[PDB]
Write an enzyme that holds these catalytic residues in place. Structure first.
Site, PDB file in Angstrom:
ATOM      1  N   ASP A 165      -2.286   2.299  -6.375  1.00  0.00           N
ATOM      2  CA  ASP A 165      -1.405   2.365  -5.209  1.00  0.00           C
ATOM      3  C   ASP A 165      -1.389   1.091  -4.363  1.00  0.00           C
ATOM      4  OD1 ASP A 165      -4.098   2.997  -4.598  1.00  0.00           O
ATOM      5  OD2 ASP A 165      -3.572   4.336  -2.962  1.00  0.00           O
ATOM      6  N   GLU A 166      -2.021   0.001  -4.817  1.00  0.00           N
ATOM      7  CA  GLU A 166      -2.196  -1.185  -3.981  1.00  0.00           C
ATOM      8  C   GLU A 166      -2.087  -2.452  -4.818  1.00  0.00           C
ATOM      9  OE1 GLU A 166      -5.414   0.629  -0.778  1.00  0.00           O
ATOM     10  OE2 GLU A 166      -5.405  -1.512  -1.362  1.00  0.00           O
ATOM     11  N   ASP A 185       0.866  -1.177   0.000  1.00  0.00           N
ATOM     12  CA  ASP A 185       0.000   0.000   0.000  1.00  0.00           C
ATOM     13  C   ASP A 185       0.902   1.225   0.000  1.00  0.00           C
ATOM     14  OD1 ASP A 185      -1.961   1.978   0.483  1.00  0.00           O
ATOM     15  OD2 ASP A 185      -3.128   0.631   1.775  1.00  0.00           O
TER      16      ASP A 185
END
Length: 342
Positions: free
Chosen positions: A104-105, A9
């Site tokens: 973003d993950e 993350d």
DNA sequence: TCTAGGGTCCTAGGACCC
DNA sequence: GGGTCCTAGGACCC
């Protein structure tokens, strides 16, 4: 058996890219989101802004009451994709079992991996570095034997940290774990669960899967499983985008079809350009439209259709506009494409 | 404070088919 | 009476 799942993350991802690319933003409160006159909401905020209470999904007008000096930024989505692609290439050096969830993950299955003596703990740390080294951005990680626990753990030591849950630690972790922390248990479901006394996984363990199957259908089986650490879902890595959508919310609501049609005319070329990147011949399974009204009710109209067509989208919007606007303002209109099944 | 834009998956009633 | 499509809506994710 027992798997090794990392959830990675990035921290305040869009904001972290803006501070990297303009250090003048480092220690003042910034956020990516539409202006208040654009009627925006915050997408992501740096930590100086969050100190004030600025959160993601917060209306920009509220964000600004909490933090009158907040700097607003509209977002540079190619500058967030270059880092996302870079980061995903770093993941590939350690395993091909990469299920991205957003820019973003991403989930990683590193069970069968062999990069740090099969230490998932050290693989994540090495991934959390490297990223730092090659992109000047920080990331947090969670390590667990299943997806949802790895995702929860990635929140535990944020920013720029990680947290490991072993199978030994799982029943302890679960006992006071609030249900709302489970991915897929959002506002509505949590309020319904709280109204029965169910607040944490410990409370759900004391429940019956049969009765849970009644009150929530196959969601109640998911609640039952998650409350016991059961999450058989596999890191997929083969997932493909199934739809393309282009919508805009206008600074002022619109009340005349001439305005609606003018919006579509600006939206359509954007949808064509993005569809053409993944489908040069523009062949699709369904296309359709979206209107969002003054009071916030929403309606969509879409139908099988073989190939992107502006006039049929205008047509469809005309019908929806006449048949369901009932005099209200319209705050957004959107176009939509459902991609062929492949 | 006044509420985004990308997306995902689930549900459910009728139509359609057996 | 049992089986898939179509479609609209909704909760939820980032």
């Amino acid at each position: 058996g027992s798997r090794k799942i990392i959830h990675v993350d990035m921290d305040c991802f869009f904001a972290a890219v803006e501070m990297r690319d303009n250090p003048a933003l480092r220690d003042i409160p910034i956020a990516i989101g539409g202006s208040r006159e654009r009627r925006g909401v915050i997408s992501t905020a740096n930590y100086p802004a969050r100190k004030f209470g600025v959160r993601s999904a917060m209306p920009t007008g509220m964000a600004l009451k909490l933090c009158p000096h907040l700097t607003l930024l509209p977002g540079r989505f190619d500058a967030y994709k270059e880092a996302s692609n870079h980061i995903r290439e770093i993941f590939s050096r350690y395993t091909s079992r990469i299920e991205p969830l957003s820019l973003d993950e991403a989930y990683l299955d590193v069970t069968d991996s062999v990069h740090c003596h099969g230490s998932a703990t050290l693989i994540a740390q090495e991934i959390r570095q490297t990223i730092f080294n090659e992109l000047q951005l920080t990331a947090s990680a969670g390590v667990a034997p299943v997806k949802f626990l790895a995702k929860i753990a990635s929140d535990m030591n944020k920013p720029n940290g990680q947290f490991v849950i072993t199978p030994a630690e799982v029943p302890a972790f679960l006992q006071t774990l609030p249900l709302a922390k489970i991915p897929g248990v959002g506002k509505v479901s949590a309020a319904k669960l709280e109204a029965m006394g169910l607040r944490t996984c410990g409370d759900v363990q004391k429940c019956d899967l049969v009765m849970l199957l009644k009150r929530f259908g196959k969601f109640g089986r998911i609640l039952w499983e998650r409350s016991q650490g059961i999450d058989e879902r596999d890191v997929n890595s083969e997932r493909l985008r199934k739809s393309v959508g282009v919508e805009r919310t206008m600074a002022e609501d619109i009340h005349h079809w001439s305005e609606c049609e003018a919006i579509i005319e600006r939206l359509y070329p954007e949808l064509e350009r993005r569809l053409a990147k993944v489908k040069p011949d523009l062949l699709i399974a369904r296309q359709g439209v979206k209107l969002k009204f003054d009071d916030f009710q929403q309606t969509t109209q879409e139908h099988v259709w073989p190939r992107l067509n502006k006039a049929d989208l205008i047509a469809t919007a005309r019908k929806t506009w006449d048949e369901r606007r009932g005099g209200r303002g319209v705050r957004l209109v959107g176009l939509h494409v459902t991609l062929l099944d492949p």
